[PDB]
Amino acid sequence: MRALVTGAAGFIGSTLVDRLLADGHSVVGLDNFATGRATNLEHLADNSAHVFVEADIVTADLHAILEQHRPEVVFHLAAQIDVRRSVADPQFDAAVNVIGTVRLAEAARQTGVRKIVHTSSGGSIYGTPPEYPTPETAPTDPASPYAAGKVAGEIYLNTFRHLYGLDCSHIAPANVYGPRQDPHGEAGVVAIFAQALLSGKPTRVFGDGTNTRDYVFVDDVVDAFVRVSADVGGGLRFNIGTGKETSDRQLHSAVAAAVGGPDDPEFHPPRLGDLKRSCLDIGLAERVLGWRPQIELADGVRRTVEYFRHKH
Amino acid sequence: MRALVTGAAGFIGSTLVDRLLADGHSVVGLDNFATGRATNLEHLADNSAHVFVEADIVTADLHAILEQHRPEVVFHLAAQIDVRRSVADPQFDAAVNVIGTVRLAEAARQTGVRKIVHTSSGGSIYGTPPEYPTPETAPTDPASPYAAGKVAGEIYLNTFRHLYGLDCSHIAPANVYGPRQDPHGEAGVVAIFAQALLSGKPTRVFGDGTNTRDYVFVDDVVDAFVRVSADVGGGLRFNIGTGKETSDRQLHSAVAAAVGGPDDPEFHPPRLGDLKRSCLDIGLAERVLGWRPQIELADGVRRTVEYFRHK
């Protein structure tokens, strides 16, 4: 089928592109390189099945783009990704994550797109939830602007589903990690730890290091995207994680073990916007999509460290 | 208290301005006249307790404005109000209703504001609801971009409440009608019927005219805004309506009885985005705020028609 991936030059996006190409699809990648990198797609230069469009979802003529490329499925991964950045500038975050999503939906409903697969944030949309691991039936209760825009994105797509019959499902990942994740930002802790420890540069945890996240390997997330792209799970959000909690301190230890380096992080002050715990109930994804995470943290971390070691 | 009202040149907004001033508050009104009218505020020219700011919530320096005026409560009524327009231009609707709300919250949290009273849409946010009358416990299920943006506004304000402790409550009105509603606007059916029947111009219904709404008078809505502005109902939405259903067709008869003469409208195609039924459970507002509507449709229609006739 014809596929279009927004955020295609990014970590998850470029990985998804590779998978869709392997599955025999024609893929249009779309990105403005806000946080994505051309290097993530450079290996595709001579692949006729891939076309890249440099575009900002906030202002580009998405109607024209979709009219030309006629995707059957749009995988919407383009977003402002950093929780702290969303606190610092909530308007910008809302522009990219809400307005960008709205413009894309409005373009899509006009061009015969069958389905949009949205990227939510299973890690943050529930805020501090009533129970862990947290099912999709739990109320959204965002406590950062990033989380709020992700929620608003889902709701708008649900609206376009009612209005035009434009199908949607929402992939709501926990904390995704693996090869191609940028080690030089403030988000993407696995990447940050791996490269810093390989380079012998300082590392840090925040608060007392007891905050937990649910760490899910990129390939597993990509598989969920592909599964939900079919006429399955229409209208639904799916938590995409492992349902296991790892503390900041425990993560550091795991990455240090994989690197074979010291396990001696610095301790820095808490970050406003960051939840204390995150753990997803992944039963619905199993039931509806037949999806289960295959990669355990130890193995995923090893593969991530190797990515940094082999980097040219 | 010091109050700021966004959308103050509008129908509900200017009415709320009057109420707050009467209650002894100082008021800053803010509007860009997208749909509001200067005539709604012209009587305030000489009142020093009131200051008006011409500003667009999407682009204005809201931080500077709120820093200057230091409002304790912000009543947020500025919005793109038309469902059909939201379908025509979802991006614009989202810019005003979502981005505008986000910019206001971000300004408010930095400027010592105690509470934002948001205006949601009780009539539309539930979409086709699981029951009637519809309680606030019913899930939101918007079926127009307008409704979606209203829900998104609520959620962003709830977010700012968690993040910064900026208090918020959501007033979710049904179908508000009464004096100062734009007779020449695209929204406002009671205004449309009143204006047209007074002019002897044609009146029309969409679909087969079976679509129902909950008609709540402006003065009752304003009272709910006042009640919820206190330290009560934090983080909560309140349906503000009558809990009584009136169809597109049945309203026409009421207006014609008030105006006089003929009672025979046309019948045009349904419009994309418009729901079929709407009726709000108003129990929560009663229990929590002590709010009850005072004005019944017949009485409210008389008032509205009389107002329009006087011009």
Ligand SMILES: NC(=O)c1ccc[n+]([C@@H]2O[C@H](COP(=O)([O-])OP(=O)(O)OC[C@H]3O[C@@H](n4cnc5c(N)ncnc54)[C@H](O)[C@@H]3O)[C@@H](O)[C@H]2O)c1
């Ligand atoms: N990594 C995680 O833990 C995780 C899990 C849940 C949610 N997500 C979501 O996954 C998606 C991909 O994130 P990622 O981890 O690969 O990070 P990333 O930064 O590599 O991916 C985001 C991509 O979107 C692009 N982009 C940003 N703004 C854009 C705009 N206005 N127009 C066009 N392109 C734009 C960036 O340039 C980048 O390539 C995002 O929607 C993110 O919110 C990430």
Ligand SMILES: NC(=O)c1ccc[n+]([C@@H]2O[C@H](COP(=O)([O-])OP(=O)(O)OC[C@H]3O[C@@H](n4cnc5c(N)ncnc54)[C@H](O)[C@@H]3O)[C@@H](O)[C@H]2O)c1
């Ligand atoms: N009338 C109803 O039935 C009803 C009920 C539920 C919800 N609402 C909400 O009530 C509020 C008031 O609506 P109304 O019925 O008085 O209509 P209105 O059009 O008279 O009031 C809206 C006001 O907002 C102003 N405004 C719009 N965009 C603006 C912007 N970008 N910057 C600054 N000001 C801007 C308009 O100029 C106008 O004065 C709105 O938030 C509306 O969505 C209306």
Ligand SMILES: O=c1ccn([C@@H]2O[C@H](COP(=O)(O)OP(=O)(O)O[C@H]3O[C@H](CO)[C@H](O)[C@H](O)[C@H]3O)[C@@H](O)[C@H]2O)c(=O)[nH]1
């Ligand atoms: O140098 C660092 C960086 C981070 N952390 C810790 O690592 C964890 C994860 O932080 P990230 O910034 O890597 O990611 P987030 O938890 O902010 O991720 C959130 O945003 C993502 C988008 O980037 C996804 O949406 C995800 O679901 C959501 O939880 C936190 O507990 C943080 O304290 C450290 O200990 N040291």
Ligand SMILES: O=c1ccn([C@@H]2O[C@H](COP(=O)(O)OP(=O)(O)O[C@H]3O[C@H](CO)[C@H](O)[C@H](O)[C@H]3O)[C@@H](O)[C@H]2O)c(=O)[nH]1
């Ligand atoms: O000439 C007309 C115009 C409208 N209508 C009918 O009148 C009803 C009300 O339409 P309005 O445009 O007056 O208002 P909405 O129903 O669109 O109101 C919605 O948007 C409002 C904001 O403008 C509020 O948010 C409200 O809660 C929400 O239901 C509809 O059934 C419509 O079909 C007619 O019969 N004839």
